[PDB]
């Protein structure tokens, strides 16, 4: 308000003290908690001067205040961030990653995090200006916690967003991230885990690089972190890795992930966490017979069947895939074990749910079970498929009979196939 002219005059003067005083006043203004007057500061024409001040390497205090003011302008809308970009600040902030002033380096790290954070395009511009390697180079065994937090956050923004950055562009981050997840600091952990969650989201080559960075054992430890801020991205990353092939999935299983994931289903945790854990388990029971056996040995099937029967629909859906996948890849005895743990009833109950994908997955699971029952029938020269009796008793047979009315052709044909094979 009433100070503004002295402030604009200060930044436009050639006097070091007036520049520092004015820039400091603007920095304070831009640091107010709610609705900082970012637009007013831009309109007052001081941004290009702030950007010039970044290059004053004789005057680290002015560089710092100017960097903080610019960080805060770049924390606003996309249009606010675009003004910082248009005035050439990104390459200058990258250069400041090599400043001998610790405060300035940290501020430059923060500023670049805010720019990268705006969108995939701004992230790509930051990476294109070579920010990654100098960001990493000034990290080491001696780095202040305040710097570790800022750099890890910025790193996570360099990795964030769809479409994803090139894997070649973010690869140098993997070894730093693999070290950072050994911090005990929750903030560093939170951001490093988000970053790994982004880098592991994609094709099996991306997952391979993440695994080769050596993170699996520690990611699995962090499944037990008491803070949801850490647990959630750790769990997301673990989930991403087991979308990969059998050997990649085995790298997670080999570090007692399954007992950890089970404890997430049995603690009193938010629905979205349990849903994530069931999805992850589902991608594990989609694996080979040894991996199914590991899920069994961990004691997961009982809890999983209870969820399938009684949980909120979002969780039930993942439990369904999880049980159905196990019936698809499992051996005869593994399948009998799922039946002895009570899976038939809940699979039957879901034949009437409004989601056709789930109806199909339940039907397929029941079909796999029926085949097993029929093999037992043959081997005992028996009269009855025991599992078809069970499906009948769970009121699954009448539900299958009504699926002959279903719109969906795949469901219809499957139902007919099942009825003709086991009830003719």
């Amino acid at each position: 308000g009433s100070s503004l002219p002295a402030m604009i005059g200060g930044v436009y003067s050639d006097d070091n003290n007036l520049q520092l005083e004015a820039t400091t006043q603007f920095r304070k203004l831009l640091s107010i908690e709610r609705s900082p007057p970012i637009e007013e500061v831009i309109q007052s024409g001081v941004v290009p001067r702030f950007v010039q001040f970044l290059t004053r390497e004789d005057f680290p205090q002015l560089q710092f205040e100017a960097a903080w003011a610019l960080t805060n302008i770049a924390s606003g809308t996309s249009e606010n961030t675009k003004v910082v970009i248009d005035h050439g600040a990104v390459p200058i902030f990258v250069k400041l990653l090599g400043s001998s002033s610790d405060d300035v380096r940290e501020q430059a790290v923060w500023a670049l995090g805010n720019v990268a954070g705006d969108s995939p395009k701004c992230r790509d511009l930051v990476l294109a200006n070579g920010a990654l390697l100098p960001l990493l180079a000034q990290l080491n065994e001696h780095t202040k916690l305040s710097m570790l937090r800022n750099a890890t956050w910025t790193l996570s923004n360099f990795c964030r967003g769809k479409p994803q950055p090139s894997f070649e562009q973010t690869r140098p981050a993997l070894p730093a991230l693999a070290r950072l997840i050994h911090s005990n600091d929750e903030e560093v952990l939170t951001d490093a885990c988000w970053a790994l969650s982004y880098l592991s989201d994609g094709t099996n080559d991306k997952i391979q690089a993440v695994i080769e960075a050596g993170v699996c054992p520690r990611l699995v430890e962090l499944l037990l972190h008491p803070s949801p801020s850490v647990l959630i991205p750790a769990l997301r990353t673990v989930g991403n890795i087991v979308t990969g092939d059998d050997a990649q999935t085995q790298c997670i299983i080999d570090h007692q992930a399954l007992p950890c994931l089970l404890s997430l289903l049995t603690q009193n945790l938010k629905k979205s966490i349990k849903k994530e854990a069931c999805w992850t388990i589902s991608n594990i029971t989609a694996g080979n017979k040894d991996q199914i056996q590991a899920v069994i040995n961990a004691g997961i099937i009982g809890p999983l069947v209870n969820l399938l029967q009684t949980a909120e629909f979002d969780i039930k859906k993942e439990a369904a895939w999880a049980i159905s996948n196990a019936t698809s890849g499992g051996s005869h005895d593994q399948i009998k074990y799922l039946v002895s743990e009570g899976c038939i009833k809940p699979l039957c109950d879901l034949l009437i749910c409004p989601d056709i994908r789930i109806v199909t997955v339940c039907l397929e699971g029941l079909e796999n079970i029926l085949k097993v029952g029929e093999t037992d029938k043959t081997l005992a020269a028996g009269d009855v498929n025991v599992f078809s009796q069970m499906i009948d008793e769970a009121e699954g047979l009448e539900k299958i009979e009504n699926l002959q009315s279903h719109d969906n052709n795949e469901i219809y044909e499957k139902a007919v196939k099942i009825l003709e094979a086991y009830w003719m």
């Binding site: 903080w68 924390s75 606003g76 996309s78 501020q107 995090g113 979308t243 694996g287």
Partner: peptide, 14 residues
């Protein structure tokens, strides 16, 4: 069984 793939601004003022 079958593997199933995974089912904005992020800024900080100082």
């Amino acid at each position: 069984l079958s593997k199933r793939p995974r089912e904005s601004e992020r800024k900080r003022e100082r």
